[PDB]
Design a binder for this molecule. Structure first.
Ligand code: CL
Length: 389
């Protein structure tokens, strides 16, 4: 109706220049200078963009937190109450100092139940007193039973490292490398390789230990950098694949200059080690996304990749970050296709697992990462040994 806008908004410009699917954006509508970037984005993306592109805030530091992730389960006959099952504890966090571990359940906070009203108090706050429990079975009935209490310090701004857990497991005559790798991130700062060097260090330890089987746990890995992914692949692959094509990054017809052919590149190994493996077991959930899915797609043609868990996210294109000049947000925009050596990325809707295991259905084996009875790792160990068909 009104106003009558005259015939310059950054987000529209960065997208029309850099977006993989710029040709499939809606036609230039009437400008809306007050709309949130989120709202602009949702209306401007191509229909193929199923939440791949997204807006993220530019923060001075990570939002403070206690350092744990969880899932709520309704309490026995309490109307408003829930128990919080811990799924991940950040190293060096208040949660870890509290003595908390994956598989612990938070049952009370300072003598009060956890209700939907107070759920956000699990994310951050002051020092808290917690009643903690564990899932127990009795012969068969199961439930969360209290086992004790602890004091959790106040939340604080935390940095979580991608190399989350490491182990070498001897198992039925095999030497099994286990890696819980949670984010494709090279280092804490813009040009740091610190985490990639942590990854190399783990692979050097794996080679020293003579690992000949491998379980890569990407279950909560939401993605990140393809250069991290190239490094990881290069170190898992069979040794006769060095220098072969791994990934074909293909941008739009306006950004041909950016196209790249990534190989299994042995000069990337540096202080790490190639493990010369023929099979890899990859643990997945719906959270497993992007770069994490690229690893699966790109290793598929070259080795036996066995997927255990639940279907992956389906993010078959790569995003790159673009920072607004003044408004402090980041546009994570789809910029390229990422084909494997067979010229394919045909996992729209996600990679279906080879063997489906929902970790939430097996509460008695919801255990710390790397414990061999932990559901998804146990499955892999059984499958490689022929215990599970
Ligand atoms: Cl953990």
């Amino acid at each position: 109706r009104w106003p009558e806008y005259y015939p310059d908004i950054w987000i529209d410009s960065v997208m029309r220049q850099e977006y993989l699917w710029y040709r499939d954006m809606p036609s230039p509508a009437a400008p809306d200078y007050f709309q949130k970037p989120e709202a602009f984005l949702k209306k401007a993306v191509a229909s193929m963009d199923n939440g791949f592109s997204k807006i993220d805030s530019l923060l001075d530091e990570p939002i403070p937190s206690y350092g744990f992730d969880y899932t709520l389960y309704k309490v026995l006959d309490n109307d408003t109450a829930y128990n919080a099952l811990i799924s991940y504890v950040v190293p060096g966090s208040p949660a870890e100092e509290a003595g908390l571990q994956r598989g612990h359940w938070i049952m009370m906070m300072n003598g009060d139940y956890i209700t939907k009203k107070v759920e956000s108090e699990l994310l951050q706050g002051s020092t808290r007193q917690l009643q903690i429990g564990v899932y127990k079975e009795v012969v068969v009935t199961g439930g969360v039973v209290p086992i004790g209490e602890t004091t959790m310090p106040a939340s604080r701004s935390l940095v979580d490292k991608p190399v989350h857990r490491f182990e070498i497991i001897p198992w039925n005559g095999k030497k099994v490398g286990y890696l819980m790798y949670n984010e494709f991130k090279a280092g804490p700062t813009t040009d740091s390789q610190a985490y990639n060097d942590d990854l190399r260090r783990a692979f050097r330890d794996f080679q020293t230990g003579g690992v000949n089987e491998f379980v890569l746990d990407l279950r909560y890995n939401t993605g990140g950098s393809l250069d991290c992914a190239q490094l990881l692949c290069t170190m898992l692959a069979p040794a006769d694949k060095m220098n072969q094509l791994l990934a074909l990054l293909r941008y739009s017809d306006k950004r041909v200059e950016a196209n790249q052919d990534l190989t299994f590149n042995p000069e990337l190994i540096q202080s790490g080690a190639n493990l010369n493996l023929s099979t890899v077991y990859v643990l997945t959930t719906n959270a497993t996304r992007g770069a994490a899915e690229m690893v699966i797609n790109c290793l598929n043609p070259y080795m036996k990749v066995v997927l255990i868990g639940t279907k992956t996210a389906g993010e078959y294109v790569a995003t790159k970050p673009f920072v607004h000049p003044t408004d402090r947000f980041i546009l994570n925009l789809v910029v390229c296709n990422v084909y494997n050596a067979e010229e394919k990325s045909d996992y729209a809707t996600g990679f279906k697992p080879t063997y489906e295991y929902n970790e939430d259905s097996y509460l008695s084996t919801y255990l710390p990462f790397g414990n061999t009875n932990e559901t998804l790792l146990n499955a892999a160990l059984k499958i490689m040994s022929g215990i599970t068909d």
